[PDB]
Amino acid sequence: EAPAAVVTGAAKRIGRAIAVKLHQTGYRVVIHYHNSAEAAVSLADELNKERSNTAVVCQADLTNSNVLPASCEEIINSCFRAFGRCDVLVNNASAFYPTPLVGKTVETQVAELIGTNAIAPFLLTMSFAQRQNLSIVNLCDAMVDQPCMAFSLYNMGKHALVGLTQSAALELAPYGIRVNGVAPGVSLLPVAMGEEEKDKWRRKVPLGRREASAEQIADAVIFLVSGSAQYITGSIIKVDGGLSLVHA
Amino acid sequence: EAPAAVVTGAAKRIGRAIAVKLHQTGYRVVIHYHNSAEAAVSLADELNKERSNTAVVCQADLTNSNVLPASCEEIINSCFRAFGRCDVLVNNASAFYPTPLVGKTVETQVAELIGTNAIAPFLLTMSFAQRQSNLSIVNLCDAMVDQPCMAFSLYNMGKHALVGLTQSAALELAPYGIRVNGVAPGVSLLPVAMGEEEKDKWRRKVPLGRREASAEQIADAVIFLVSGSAQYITGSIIKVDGGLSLVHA
Amino acid sequence: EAPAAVVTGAAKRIGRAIAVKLHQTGYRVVIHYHNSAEAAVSLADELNKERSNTAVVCQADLTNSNVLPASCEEIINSCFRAFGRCDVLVNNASAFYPTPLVKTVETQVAELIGTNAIAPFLLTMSFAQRQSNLSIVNLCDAMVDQPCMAFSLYNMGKHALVGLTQSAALELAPYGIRVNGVAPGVSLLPVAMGEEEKDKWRRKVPLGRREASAEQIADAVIFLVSGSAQYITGSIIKVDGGLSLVHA
Amino acid sequence: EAPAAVVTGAAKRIGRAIAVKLHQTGYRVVIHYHNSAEAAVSLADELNKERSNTAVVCQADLTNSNVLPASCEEIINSCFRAFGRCDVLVNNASAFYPTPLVGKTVETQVAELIGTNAIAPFLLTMSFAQRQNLSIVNLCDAMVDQPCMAFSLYNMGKHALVGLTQSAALELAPYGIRVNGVAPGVSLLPVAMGEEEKDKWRRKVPLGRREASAEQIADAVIFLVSGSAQYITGSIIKVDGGLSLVHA
Ligand SMILES: NC(=O)c1ccc[n+]([C@@H]2O[C@H](COP(=O)([O-])OP(=O)(O)OC[C@H]3O[C@@H](n4cnc5c(N)ncnc54)[C@H](OP(=O)(O)O)[C@@H]3O)[C@@H](O)[C@H]2O)c1
Ligand SMILES: NC(=O)c1ccc[n+]([C@@H]2O[C@H](COP(=O)([O-])OP(=O)(O)OC[C@H]3O[C@@H](n4cnc5c(N)ncnc54)[C@H](OP(=O)(O)O)[C@@H]3O)[C@@H](O)[C@H]2O)c1
Ligand SMILES: NC(=O)c1ccc[n+]([C@@H]2O[C@H](COP(=O)([O-])OP(=O)(O)OC[C@H]3O[C@@H](n4cnc5c(N)ncnc54)[C@H](OP(=O)(O)O)[C@@H]3O)[C@@H](O)[C@H]2O)c1
Ligand SMILES: NC(=O)c1ccc[n+]([C@@H]2O[C@H](COP(=O)([O-])OP(=O)(O)OC[C@H]3O[C@@H](n4cnc5c(N)ncnc54)[C@H](OP(=O)(O)O)[C@@H]3O)[C@@H](O)[C@H]2O)c1
Ligand SMILES: N#Cc1c(-c2ccccc2)[nH]c2nc(N)[nH]c(=O)c12
Ligand SMILES: N#Cc1c(-c2ccccc2)[nH]c2nc(N)[nH]c(=O)c12
Ligand SMILES: N#Cc1c(-c2ccccc2)[nH]c2nc(N)[nH]c(=O)c12
Ligand SMILES: N#Cc1c(-c2ccccc2)[nH]c2nc(N)[nH]c(=O)c12
Incomplete structure (x- = not known):
């Protein structure tokens, strides 16, 4: 019987590549998505x-709320109902936008950024463990100690995710479930980012002056x-081409 | 004119010590509390x-909710109402209890542990800056964040998020001339719930003196x-842990 | 043509398993050793x-001295002499013994700092200057911030090795040479260490209550x-079963 | 009776400001120097x-050598001769110059850079401890994980110094001796640096767009x-105006 994996935010970009690569390795996959329904069904x-x-x-919204625990239980349930097992959880889904210290209300921003990046991963980890080569992989950020200006809530979520990776x-460990992270520097650049800013980030990367592909x-x-x-458990592997080593 | 400081969770223990020492240095103080009304009033x-x-x-509940931003704005408002200024914010209030992965619901646990340790500090920081000398913010962190207590995932997540806030903020x-730093205890005043036997176990682990940090330290x-x-100094987190975080298992 | 690797301290234990695994993957290997001549010849x-x-x-002594740079240049030379190329360097050799603050101290410094830090630096220099998939891997220590009591010089050396890994x-990077680290917690325990002390260490590991195999x-x-x-460059991967996450 | 402090490299710049403040606080001071005899004598x-x-x-050369243990013993000896006691040791003296990987020989560069920044502090720590509010303060580097290009040996030394701070x-601790570090980002910029280059560093600092005074x-x-x-023991306090927080 082939093992099964859940990948959150798997319709596009890095989540999609992880889903595809896991599938090619021999896994059956639960493709979680939020808004990208056509892309998700196309991948399936x-x-x-x-x-x-x-x-x-x-489908599930992973914003923090009173119903999030139930939503995270249902994502893990979907793997068991379809495949009868769940061997791997990849916490990939993520809100990413600025929240200056000095449109969306601040409480919504908190719910989205801390929900997707930290609280949902915690609830999915809870459900994954309770329902049992088992492992969990959390998508972290290699730049968490040199954060983007005005992204305090996103940065807080990614720090929280490091804490979860270690605590979990x-x-x-006594249950034989390993928990690790992968920390990109710059990979697929955000869709909205202008071409000039994209080029500036590329030129900062020591190894090849380009971004990581989603496949890398x-x-x-x-x-x-x-x-x-x-x-290997409790380890966070940077995949950043030396970007985090580069001073101001 | 004397400067003014807000200290969250200041009615007792480490918060009280911070409030007292700030007062003794020349600050006017806002003593924030949640349930400890008698202690807070006695200190004031x-x-x-x-x-x-x-x-x-x-008084304010710092549990996460849709009104938390309003509660945090009001704590900073109170300092301006009393003293006409707010120079220092100390984020000390903290919920602390285990949350195993395998009568509080998980929603409540998330709201209290992530709210008190991370989201409230963020919202208080927002409101503090929005209202703006020698201005600064001090966050009470944890020296043991990378060697966490078993089954304290949500607490640990909160304190990690607080390190992120400290650096990000x-x-x-910096451009507004507000410095943001942390103080990270190891074992200080041990929980009142903890038995004497278990307190001794923790004391014996500390390289420097085999004892806990006083609140004053x-x-x-x-x-x-x-x-x-x-x-x-900004973005720095000073451990005050007697070497505890250096000790392997 | 098959690529070539240099593994320092390759006669026994972890170094031997690295040399063997590189060879199985298709590499030609230079097996460096200091005193273990019979084991090194047997492996070859x-x-x-x-x-x-x-x-x-x-054969080479990697103790610090004024001739250490020449010894390190000669190790890289030996790979080129034998195989006409050098694609991989693994800095594995290591002196490990206590040096209480309260053998001469000159010797202890020369051995502990030489093997763990300076020799890696000089080997990295020679490797680079002689220059695909080029990379260097440094054997670090997962417990570097929770050091063994009375091992200051060893600990200093391994800290220096992190610095070399990041700096190099x-x-x-502009030469296409990646530099990374692998950081064991406890793997093959010291030959001198007593059985009660080995059991003490094994019982501390969250993932399985056992040391890592040299193969892991x-x-x-x-x-x-x-x-x-x-x-991936400038990254140190912990392989420690969660040991570094355990408080005193 | 008043306490006594040894400050290495105390003739000029940061070391001088440290000696002055210690003296103003009530300490008697040993002013250690290497070449700057006029400045040291004038400060005394x-x-x-x-x-x-x-x-x-x-006076003492703190380059690594066969005589360095003796030399470090004599620095501590000089405090006891003059003042009958030694309460504080500040490891401040440091060599700082580039050592690219691709007229000083490399062995000499190793001796100077690793000697001043790591080995001498270790030997002075040994001698200080052997001879007994006691504490040691090591001058570290806030940018040790985002290192200057082509400063590998300097960076290795400063990493080693973090190791010593923690190990010691x-x-x-059992003897009541605390060991901590202070980590500047940019403070007094090197005399050899051109004013244009100095201005570039100053512009990078979030808190005030300037370097730290030696007094800070x-x-x-x-x-x-x-x-x-x-x-407080085993703690390293950054004094860097946020510089280490700034991405490339
Ligand atoms: N890209 C980079 O250079 C980079 C750098 C550092 C770290 N990372 C991390 O690596 C991971 C993948 O990066 P990425 O760039 O591929 O991510 P991304 O495109 O920005 O987001 C991935 C997915 O997250 C889902 N998502 C967003 N909000 C959600 C919500 N409220 N509820 C449920 N799902 C939600 C979205 O799904 P739908 O499209 O279906 O709505 C989205 O497609 C992320 O965790 C990211 O933080 C990436
Ligand atoms: N004690 C240690 O050994 C230690 C170790 C590491 C880190 N720390 C950190 O140092 C700081 C002080 O430690 P401590 O032991 O003195 O703290 P504590 O007694 O456990 O908590 C301090 C105060 O936090 C307030 N608080 C709890 N839940 C709240 C809520 N939902 N809303 C608003 N306030 C709430 C309480 O106020 P009321 O009493 O008024 O209800 C309490 O008095 C904390 O941030 C802690 O995490 C302490
Ligand atoms: N074993 C663990 O649990 C553990 C834990 C953390 C880190 N590590 C690291 O992983 C690596 C391998 O560990 P290990 O236990 O297999 O190492 P090891 O047995 O202690 O040493 C490996 C080899 O280093 C060589 N060596 C010692 N002094 C030398 C010198 N002066 N000049 C040249 N070579 C010298 C020896 O070669 P000869 O026998 O030929 O003389 C020895 O066989 C080391 O870097 C170690 O620090 C290991
Ligand atoms: N300045 C900064 O922006 C900065 C930044 C990060 C870290 N730091 C650290 O803070 C400390 C002080 O910095 P600084 O700029 O004031 O230092 P510095 O001027 O570069 O050096 C201080 C002293 O070190 C002594 N020294 C150099 N080589 C020596 C040797 N072989 N033997 C004995 N002494 C030797 C010299 O003494 P003589 O003049 O008598 O020959 C020199 O005056 C250093 O440890 C440095 O690494 C400084
Ligand atoms: N670029 C970028 C991103 C980064 C990032 C890129 C560079 C430095 C720090 C963070 N994080 C992201 N997270 C999500 N979910 N999506 C993104 O596109 C990114
Ligand atoms: N002991 C203890 C505490 C610790 C703590 C103690 C030892 C290791 C890690 C954490 N954290 C706390 N936070 C709050 N709010 N209150 C506490 O009492 C503690
Ligand atoms: N055990 C162990 C070792 C460790 C070590 C193991 C646990 C904590 C810290 C260090 N380091 C070593 N280095 C060498 N060269 N050889 C060893 O056996 C070890
Ligand atoms: N500038 C600078 C220095 C730095 C430094 C400054 C900024 C980033 C990294 C290093 N380190 C130094 N060490 C010594 N001994 N002397 C110096 O001048 C500096």
Whole structure:
């Protein structure tokens, strides 16, 4: 029987690449999405065409709220209902936008940024553990200690996610569930970012003066879920081409 | 005119010590509290007896909710109402209890632990800056954030988020001349719930003296960070832990 | 043509497993050693029996001295002499013993700082100057911020090795040379260490209550030298079973 | 009776400001220097004019060598000769120049850079501890994880110094000796640096767009040796105006 993985925010960009690469490795996949329904269903079609009965979708808002615990239970449930098991959880989904200290209300910003980046990962981890080569991989940020100007809530969420990776590694080790992170620097640049700013970020990266492909990020996720990482838990692997080493 | 400080969770223990030492240095203080009304009022009485009209109390629940931004704005408002200015914010209030992964609901646990330790400090920082000398903010962190207590995931997540706020806020508020720093205890005043046997277990782990930090020793680090001797220090988190975080399992 | 690797301290234990795993992956290997001549020759014999003309030995003392730079240049030379190329350097050799603050101290400094830091630096210099998929892997220590009592000089050396890893990753990026680290917690325990003390350490590891095999450490080295880690540089991967996360 | 402090590299710049503030606080001081004899003697003259026989000078090369242990012993010896006691050690003296990976020989660069920044502090720590509000303060570097291009040996030394700070804090705690660090970002910029290049660094600092005065660095040292830091050991306080927080 093939193992099964849940990947949050898997319809596009890095989540999509992780889902595809896990599928190619032999996993059956739950494609979670929020708004990108067409992309999600298109991915499931592609993967099922490759191997029958190996991909499904699950929609959920991962903003923090009174119903989030139930929403996270249902995402994990969807893996069990379709595939009868859940071996891997990849916390990839993420809100990312500025929240200056000095449109959306501040309480909504808190809910979205801390919800997607930290609280949802915690609730999904809870549900994943309770329902049991098991492992969880959290998508972190290599630049968390040199944060983007005016992104305090996003940065707080990513710091919180490091805490979860370590706390969960410690607590779930007795159950044989490993918990690790992968920390991109710059990978697929945000859709809205202008071409001039995109070029400025590329020119800062020591290794090749370009961004990581989504596949290069997925390669690190594949390593951490594999048998070659069976003693690795609580580790966060930077995949940033030396960007975080570069001073102001 | 004397400067003014807000200290959250100041009715007892480390918060009280910070409030007292700030007062003794020359600050007027807002003593924020949640449930400890009698203690807060008693402290304000003691400080006002030393110097008239230099201490007030301010009640607020810092659990996460849609009104938390309003509550945080109001704590800063209260400092301006009493003293006409607000120079120092100390984020000390904290919920602390285990939340195992495997009669509070998980929603409540998230709201209290992430609210008190991270979101409230963020909203108080927003309101503090929005209203703006020697201005600074001090966040009470945790020296053991990378070697966390078993089954304290949400608390640990909160304190990690607080490190992020400290760095992010230091970067962003530097242009306004507001410094943002942290003080990170190891073991200080042990919980009142904890039994004496278990307290001794923790004391025995500390390289420097085999004892916990007094509240005053923690307050000493806060006073340094707010002082003129720390004018170029921002984004720094000073451990005050007697070497505890250096000890392997 | 097969690529070539230098592994320092490769006669025994973790170094041996790295050399063997690199060889199985297809590398030709220089097996460096200091005192373990018989074990080093035996390894080279076994690898050459598998694939003729794919292994040689190279003896060198890596204690700090005024001739250490020449010794390190000669190790890199030996790879080129044998195989006409040098693609991978693994800095594994290490002196490990206590040096209480309260053998001469000159010797202790020369051995502990030389093997763990200065020799890696000089080998990195020689490797770079002689220059695809080029990279360097440094054997670090996951417990570097929770040090063993009375091991100041060892700890200083391993801290220095982190600094080298980061500094060299930055400077050598424009030459396409990646520089990374693998940081064991407890793996193969010291030969001198008593059985009660070994059991004490094993019981502290969250993930399985046992030390890592030398093979589990080699697995992370292999990941870092591979095409799956092409955007990874300046990264140190802990392989410690969660040991570094455990408070006193 | 008044306490006594040894400050290495105390003739000029940051070391001088530290010696002055320690003296103003009530300490008697050993002013250590290497080449700057005129400045050292003139500083002692100034302090002795304030309070009779409260300052002495002590010359020593802190480059790594066979005689360095003896030399460090004699620096501590000189404090006891002059003042009958040694309460505080400040490791401030430092070599700082580039050492690219691709007329000094490399062995000499190793000796100077690793000697001044790491090995000498270690030997002075040994001698200080052996001879016993006692504390040691090590001058570190806030930018140690975002290092200057082509400064590998300097960076390795400063990393090693973090290792010493932590290892010695642990080991010397039972004797009541605290061991901490102060980590400037940019303070007094090097004399050899051109004013255009100095201006570029100043413009990078979030808090005030300028470098730290030597006195601001001295302020953190005074805090760490005071009674207001009695429970603080193994801590490194950045004094960098937010510089280490700024991405590339
Ligand atoms: N891209 C980079 O250079 C970079 C750098 C550092 C870290 N990372 C991290 O790597 C991961 C992947 O990065 P990325 O750039 O691919 O991410 P992304 O495109 O910005 O977002 C990934 C997905 O998150 C989902 N999402 C957003 N808000 C949500 C919500 N409220 N509820 C549920 N799902 C929500 C979205 O799903 P729908 O489209 O279906 O709405 C989105 O497609 C993220 O965790 C990110 O923080 C990326
Ligand atoms: N004590 C230690 O050994 C230690 C170790 C590491 C870090 N720290 C940190 O240092 C700081 C002080 O420690 P402590 O032990 O003195 O703290 P504490 O007694 O556990 O808590 C301090 C105050 O936080 C307030 N608080 C709790 N929940 C609240 C809520 N929902 N809304 C508003 N206020 C709330 C309480 O106010 P009321 O009493 O008025 O209800 C309480 O008196 C904390 O941030 C803590 O995390 C302490
Ligand atoms: N083992 C662990 O649990 C552990 C934990 C943390 C980090 N590490 C790191 O992982 C690496 C491998 O560990 P290990 O336990 O396998 O190492 P090890 O057995 O202690 O040492 C490996 C080799 O280093 C060589 N060596 C010692 N002094 C030398 C010198 N002066 N000049 C040249 N070579 C010298 C020796 O070669 P010869 O026998 O030929 O003389 C020895 O076989 C080391 O870097 C170590 O620090 C290991
Ligand atoms: N300045 C900054 O922006 C900055 C930034 C980060 C860290 N730091 C650290 O803070 C400390 C003070 O900085 P600084 O700029 O004031 O230092 P510095 O001027 O570069 O050096 C201080 C002294 O070190 C002594 N020294 C150099 N080589 C020596 C040797 N081989 N043996 C004995 N002494 C030697 C010299 O003494 P003589 O003059 O008598 O020969 C020199 O005056 C240093 O540890 C430095 O690394 C400074
Ligand atoms: N670029 C970028 C992103 C970064 C980022 C990029 C550079 C430095 C720090 C963060 N984080 C992101 N998170 C999400 N969810 N989506 C993104 O596009 C990014
Ligand atoms: N002891 C303890 C505490 C700790 C703590 C103590 C030891 C290691 C890690 C954390 N954190 C606390 N936070 C609050 N709010 N109150 C406490 O009492 C503590
Ligand atoms: N155990 C162990 C070792 C450790 C070590 C193990 C646990 C904590 C800190 C260090 N480091 C070593 N280095 C070498 N060269 N050889 C060893 O065996 C070890
Ligand atoms: N500028 C600067 C220095 C720095 C430095 C400044 C900024 C970033 C990294 C290092 N370190 C120094 N060490 C010594 N001994 N002397 C110096 O002048 C500096």
